[PDB]
Write a protein that binds this ligand. Structure first.
Ligand SMILES: CCC1=C(C)/C(=C/C2=NC(=C\c3[nH]c(/C=C4\NC(=O)[C@H](C)[C@H]4CC)c(C)c3CCC(=O)O)/C(CCC(=O)O)=C2C)NC1=O
Lengths: 54, 158
């Protein structure tokens, strides 16, 4: 058995840990706020109706 | 206004007699509870803003139509007058709790309040519901010690 066969090649990924996601989390919170506004607008439209006219 | 001791004094004076054993017993009973009543009053005073906040929250959660246009609590001015009334009720209930007598509520709170509310169109049952919500908040906070005074305000409106 004399062919050179390579068994354990190192991977592409680096050894470091996961970079933090604070800026991504902030932008996601911005999207959440935008999405909450579009439902809050409808419910607010509901809030401004007259009192006893059912 | 009167407190408990002055009320007992007036009771013994209407009969033109000196204090007897029962009168001294009643006055002693009032003095014994004074520390607890002062603690309750201080506790209410420390959190008056939060009591008022959650009392108005309870009132307007029960009856949302008051806040809606055409409701008696729809404007900044009328909402403010409503929460100011509730703040009055809490402060004067605290005064009465300290005094041990409800005459402060008669002199300073119910002196034309029911007539005022009937004249202005303020809904009295809704106001009593708000007073009752504040009574429940204060009771959960300090105990039953103040219930009667809030009921007094309710009876002054009902
Ligand atoms: C210190 C003793 C004292 C008390 C007790 C008092 C109560 C009081 N509340 C009033 C009006 C009012 N009171 C209320 C509160 C009502 N709104 C309803 O939705 C609720 C159910 C309810 C309260 C829980 C409102 C909205 C007004 C305004 C009435 C109007 O402008 O048409 C008024 C007429 C004058 C004014 O608005 O300033 C008085 C005198 N004022 C005092 O000086």
């Amino acid at each position: 058995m004399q062919p050179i066969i390579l068994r354990t090649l190192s991977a592409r990924r680096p050894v470091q840990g996961r970079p933090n996601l604070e800026t991504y989390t902030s932008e996601v919170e911005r999207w959440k706020a935008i999405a909450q506004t579009q439902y809050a607008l409808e419910l607010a439209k509901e809030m401004s109706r007259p009192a006893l006219r059912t | 206004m009167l407190d408990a001791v002055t009320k007992i004094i007036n009771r013994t004076d209407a009969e033109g007699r000196y204090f007897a054993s029962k009168d001294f017993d009643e006055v002693t009973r009032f003095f014994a509870t004074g520390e607890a009543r002062l603690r309750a009053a201080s506790t209410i005073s420390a959190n008056a803003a939060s009591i008022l906040r959650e009392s108005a929250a309870a009132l307007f959660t029960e009856q949302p139509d008051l806040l809606r246009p055409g409701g008696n609590a729809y404007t900044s001015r009328r909402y403010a007058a409503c929460v100011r009334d509730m703040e009055y009720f809490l402060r004067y209930a605290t005064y009465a709790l300290v005094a041990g007598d409800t005459s402060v509520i008669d002199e300073r709170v119910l002196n034309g309040l029911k007539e005022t509310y009937m004249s202005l169109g303020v809904p009295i049952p809704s106001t009593v519901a708000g007073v009752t919500a504040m009574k429940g908040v204060v009771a959960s906070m300090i105990g039953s010690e103040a219930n009667v005074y809030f009921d007094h305000i309710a009876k002054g409106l009902s």
